[PDB]
């Protein structure tokens, strides 16, 4: 699965730069090693800081402060496509930022044939205001009187003696 990490890093201090600036990024990766490499290439492509002359100063996994409250997360991401450039913004209702990112990765691999390396996440933000929600299906979930029967009921022990119920 995925875990959210904060990676703080800087280049090695020298005489030219006695106090190098400290760069922190919030990013998602299965483990710390992938997170550090994910961060290093991001730092290379944004600020041209080489991996050799830099160092990861702080690694910290982050847990969801309120995993028991359903939230709506809007995700700004950039995609590499045939043209090599695209921008998308999706909304997912889930109780955890990590799960929202996992759902985003599954949806994009399902729709646009996107892989982990092809997807770079710009921002995952929480949308508390109902009006700020843009997606109609999210608004459908947010309606106060939501109700619906179970979808995809679908139901070793081969050779059942009776016919299936698949109803109530």
């Amino acid at each position: 699965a995925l875990k959210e990490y904060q990676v703080v890093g800087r280049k090695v201090p020298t005489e030219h730069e006695p106090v190098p600036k400290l760069f922190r990024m919030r990013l998602f990766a299965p483990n710390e090693s992938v997170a550090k490499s994910r961060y290093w290439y991001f730092l290379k492509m944004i600020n041209k800081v080489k991996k050799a002359t830099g160092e990861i100063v702080a690694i910290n996994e982050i847990s969801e402060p309120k995993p028991l409250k359903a939230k709506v997360f809007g995700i700004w991401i950039r995609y590499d496509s045939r043209s090599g450039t695209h921008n998308m913004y999706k909304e997912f209702r889930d109780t955890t930022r990590v799960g929202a990112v996992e759902a985003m990765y599954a949806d994009m691999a399902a729709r646009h044939r996107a892989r982990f390396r092809s997807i770079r996440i710009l921002k995952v933000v929480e949308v508390e205001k109902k009006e700020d929600v843009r997606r109609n299906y999210v608004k459908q979930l947010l309606n106060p009187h939501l109700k619906f029967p179970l979808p995809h009921r679908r139901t070793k022990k081969v050779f059942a003696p009776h016919r299936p119920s698949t109803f109530y």
Partner: peptide, 21 residues
């Protein structure tokens, strides 16, 4: 060259800044 030794990295002077790709 040996591996880099443990040291300190004071941030009160330069607090970490959020970077987004």
């Amino acid at each position: 060259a040996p591996p880099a030794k443990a040291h300190f990295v004071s941030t009160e002077n330069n607090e970490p800044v959020t970077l987004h790709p």
